[PDB]
């Protein structure tokens, strides 16, 4: 079950990184939109 | 010397166990739990195999091919709840657990219905 455990641990590590990347991209888009409007 | 992959390549297209009627391909094999013509369920050529069969009365008999007495056709198959049947099969072949479970349930239901129509 070592392979399965490694797989599930890696997936649990990847989901949070995807969420963090989404969160960062949202802020970057907000800032750029504001400056373009100005 | 001659492996299961080679044998499957040799018999996939014509065999006495392959029934191609209409456009449907079934299997006549007595050691097949499904009827599908695939290498997983072709139990007559695999090294290890297990099949669930109906027995006298309400008994359920499981026939197991251990894989050590192949090349001795008279000693190839030695006989032996649905969870118990599945655990019995999974010792020989783990990938034959779900189908054997469902087959045991279906055999029990067939026996019950036969007893019903016998009483009627």
């Amino acid at each position: 079950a070592a392979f399965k455990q490694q797989q599930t641990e890696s997936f649990k590590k990847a989901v949070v990184a995807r969420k963090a990347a989404k969160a960062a991209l949202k802020k970057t888009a907000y800032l750029r939109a504001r400056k373009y409007s100005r | 010397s001659h492996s299961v992959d080679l044998q499957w390549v040799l018999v996939r297209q014509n065999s006495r166990f392959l029934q191609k009627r209409g456009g449907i391909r079934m299997s006549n094999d007595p050691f097949n739990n499904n009827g599908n013509w695939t290498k997983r369920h072709c139990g007559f050529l695999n090294e290890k195999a297990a099949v669930v069969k109906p027995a006298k009365g309400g008994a359920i008999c499981v026939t197991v091919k251990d894989g050590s007495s192949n090349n001795k056709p008279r000693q190839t198959y030695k006989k032996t709840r649905a969870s118990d049947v599945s655990r019995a099969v999974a010792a020989v072949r783990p990938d034959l657990a779900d189908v054997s479970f469902r087959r045991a349930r279906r055999m029990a239901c067939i026996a019950s219905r036969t007893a019903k129509v016998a009483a009627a």
């Binding site: - | 992959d5 080679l6 040799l10």
Partner: protein, 196 residues
């Protein structure tokens, strides 16, 4: 309606599956398709592509050519590293013009009886592709080789023999019949042996 004129002239003709009837060839293709799909190496992709080809496009190779190219690679290689494994998707034939060869490991689809005997006598090993998949699953430290195609009689016949600059053989069963007119200047003319 969309204007897509001359869009079928971009289509390419590839093979994608084998016409061979050999079950062992089919087993090898089954192994190396999986390897090429699940591995990042280019060796596996090339080998898979060459297993699908036809017999005429897998030309045989020679023991003398193998020995020569291996030596030319070896002269510039560190003295502590090991020699590679020669791999050919095809047949390996013998050469009576070279008597003594080094000890090499060769992998091929087929060996002549004489080629096998020569290799083992010199002190090497003849491998199969299923053994190679277990020694070098990615193809590290290998020498991929191809056999020669030109010099075939069909290739030397391709073309028109009677146009200037052309040196292809004609289709004729009598060797003394087609000489003279169009081949000698004493007759009407002679076709020119060179053209820019």
């Amino acid at each position: 309606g969309v204007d897509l004129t001359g869009i079928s002239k971009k289509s390419r003709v590839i093979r994608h599956h084998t016409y061979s009837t050999n079950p062992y060839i089919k087993l090898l293709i089954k192994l190396y398709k999986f390897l090429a799909k699940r591995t990042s190496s280019g060796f596996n992709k090339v080998v898979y592509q060459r297993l699908i080809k036809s017999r005429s496009n897998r030309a045989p190779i020679s023991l003398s050519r193998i020995a020569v190219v291996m030596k030319r690679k070896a002269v510039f290689t560190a003295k502590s590293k090991a020699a590679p494994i020669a791999v050919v998707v095809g047949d390996v034939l013998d050469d009576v013009r070279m008597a003594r060869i080094p000890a090499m490991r060769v992998c091929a689809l087929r060996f002549s009886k004489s080629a096998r005997q020569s290799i083992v006598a010199a002190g090497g090993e003849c491998l199969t592709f299923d053994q190679l998949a277990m020694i070098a699953p990615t193809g590290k430290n290998t020498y991929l080789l191809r056999g020669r195609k030109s010099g075939r009689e069909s290739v030397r016949h391709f073309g028109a023999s009677g146009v200037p600059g052309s040196h292809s053989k004609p289709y004729a069963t009598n060797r003394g019949k087609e000489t003279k007119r169009g081949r000698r200047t004493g007759r009407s003319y002679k076709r020119k042996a060179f053209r820019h």
